[PDB]
Design a protein around this ligand. Structure first.
Ligand SMILES: CCCCCCCCCCCC[C@@H]1O[C@@H]2O[C@@H](COP(=O)(O)OP(=O)(O)OC[C@H]3O[C@@H](n4cnc5c(N)ncnc54)[C@H](O)[C@@H]3O)[C@@H](O)[C@@H]2O1
Ligand SMILES: NC(=O)c1cccnc1
Lengths: 6, 296
């Protein structure tokens, strides 16, 4: 998966 | 995945005794921007000093856009202006960084997974076999066109940034991008290959200077076996599960292996080294290496 926030 | 309690007490002192017992052979560090703030690189979410409180001047839609690959592809100039503002005149790793260098020298460091891009882990003496730069690095840059992909060193990327010329490939005139993993980009393959193997055998998680709010990096804490102790050294607690959403549990009635040491990462690593009998080693190491860098 991709570098994501939250 | 049977929850045994390996620390004789959920404190720094208990972690220390555990580290110098035979059970504890393989240490994984997970680190973030908190371990480099005392080096002059601000973090993101610290109120006031964090980047998110300091991006008004970049005319951006919202604050987060300046670290998103999409927005960067449309408009690379803000990021590169920001890069010039943040670029430190001197790269000097911290006490915290040299603590991890001590783990390496003592044969304890299985890996350091870092979210930082500032190369300070390398300068402290961590080598590619020790390091997973989970979000890339400023150390090398590449032409973005699937064609050149030619590589440029930091020396060349720094000149472009300070002369306020957007970096273009000398061979193809495409944009040249630091090997940083932007938001919305895929993490390096080495991140996944290391994590599938490293977390089968880890005896201690050392989590330092990270709010554990970026995925998939933050999920690393859940990859260790359930009896692996986990020490957080950080300004405030992090990695606990939301009450509405294997998080950290320092305080519940079921807490059995997580420890939160709250303060500066430099101070926490200093205190841990003292308990280990490493304090003088650590002071000598930091003073010698800082002296060497100060004289460059
Ligand atoms: C080469 C020179 C040029 C560089 C300029 C380019 C920069 C742009 C790179 C873009 C990077 C892209 C990607 O985007 C992600 O975003 C980031 C993930 O955020 P994170 O690593 O977790 O750091 P934080 O801001 O969210 O919070 C930090 C936590 O630690 C605590 N703290 C803070 N100071 C201390 C302290 N002194 N002692 C203890 N604790 C402390 C604090 O209380 C908090 O809990 C990154 O890693 C991820 O990379
Ligand atoms: N030191 C770093 O690479 C850094 C700083 C702020 C936010 N994310 C990463």
């Amino acid at each position: 998966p991709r570098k994501q926030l939250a | 995945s049977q929850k045994e309690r390996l620390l004789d007490e959920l404190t720094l002192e208990g972690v220390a005794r555990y580290m110098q017992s035979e059970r504890c052979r393989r240490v994984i560090c997970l680190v973030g921007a908190g371990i480099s703030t005392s080096a002059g690189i601000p973090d993101f979410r610290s109120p006031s000093t964090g980047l998110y409180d300091n991006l008004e001047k970049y005319h951006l839609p919202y604050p987060e856009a300046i670290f998103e690959i999409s927005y960067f592809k449309k408009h690379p100039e803000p990021f590169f202006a920001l890069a010039k503002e943040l670029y430190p005149g001197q790269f000097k790793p911290t006490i915290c960084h040299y603590f991890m260098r001590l783990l390496k020298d003592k044969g304890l460091l299985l890996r350091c997974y870092t979210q930082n891009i500032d190369t300070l882990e390398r300068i402290a003496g961590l080598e590619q076999e020790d390091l997973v730069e989970a979000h890339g690095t400023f150390y090398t840059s590449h032409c973005v066109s699937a064609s050149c992909r030619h590589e440029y060193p930091l020396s060349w990327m720094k000149e472009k940034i300070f002369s306020e010329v957007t970096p273009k490939c000398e061979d193809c005139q495409s944009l040249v991008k630091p090997d940083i993993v932007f938001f919305g980009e895929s993490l390096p393959a080495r991140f996944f290959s290391c994590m599938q193997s490293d977390f089968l055998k880890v005896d201690l998680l050392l989590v330092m200077g990270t709010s554990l709010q970026v995925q998939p990096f933050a999920s690393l804490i859940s990859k260790a076996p359930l009896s692996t102790p986990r020490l957080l050294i950080n300004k405030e607690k992090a990695g606990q599960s939301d009450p509405f959403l294997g998080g950290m549990d320092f305080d519940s009635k079921k807490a059995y292996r997580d420890v939160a040491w709250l303060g500066e990462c430099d101070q926490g690593c200093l205190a841990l080294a003292e308990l280990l009998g490493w304090k003088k080693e650590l002071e000598d190491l930091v003073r010698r290496e800082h002296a060497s860098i100060d004289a460059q």
